[PDB]
Amino acid sequence: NPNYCFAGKTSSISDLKEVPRKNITLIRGLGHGAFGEVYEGQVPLQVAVKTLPEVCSEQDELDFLMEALIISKFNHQNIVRCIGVSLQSLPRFILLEFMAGGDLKSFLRETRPRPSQPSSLAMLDLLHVARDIACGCQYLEENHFIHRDIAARNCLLTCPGPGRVAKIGDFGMARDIYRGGCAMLPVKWMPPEAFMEGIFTSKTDTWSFGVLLWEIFSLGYMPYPSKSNQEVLEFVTSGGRMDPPKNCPGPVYRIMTQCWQHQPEDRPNFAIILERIEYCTQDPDVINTALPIEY
Enzyme catalytic residues: 149
| Burial degree of 95 (CB within 10 A; 0-12, 13-18, 19+) | buried
Segment contacting ligand 5P8 (CB under 6 A): 9-17, 100-108, 196-204, 214-222?
100-108
Q: What are the angstrom distances between the C-alpha of 201 and each of 4, 101, 138, 165, 272?
A: 19, 30, 13, 26, 16
Work out whether 149 is an interface residue with ligand 5P8 (CB under 6 A).
no
| Cα–Cα distance for residue pair 76/270, rounded to 1 Å | 15
Work out whether 95 is an interface residue with ligand 5P8 (CB under 6 A).
no
- Give the 3-state secondary structure of residue 90: coil
Say if residues 249 and 204 touch (Cβ distance below 8 Å).
no
Site for ligand 5P8 in 58-87 (CB under 6 A): 80
Segment contacting ligand 5P8 (CB under 6 A): 3-11, 13-21, 27-35, 223-231?
27-35
Work out whether 170 is an interface residue with ligand 5P8 (CB under 6 A).
yes
User: Which of 63, 67, 97, 215 forms a contact with ligand 5P8 (CB under 6 A)?
Assistant: 97
Nearer to ligand 5P8, 99 or 140 (CB): 99
Whether the upstream peptide bond of residue 113 has omega within 30° of 0, thus cis, is: no
Q: Using CB under 6 A, count the residues that bind ligand 5P8.
A: 19
Work out whether 103 is an interface residue with ligand 5P8 (CB under 6 A).
yes
Work out whether 208 is an interface residue with ligand 5P8 (CB under 6 A).
no
Work out whether 99 is an interface residue with ligand 5P8 (CB under 6 A).
yes
| Burial degree of 269 (CB within 10 A; 0-12, 13-18, 19+) | middle
Work out whether 132 is an interface residue with ligand 5P8 (CB under 6 A).
no
Work out whether 30 is an interface residue with ligand 5P8 (CB under 6 A).
yes
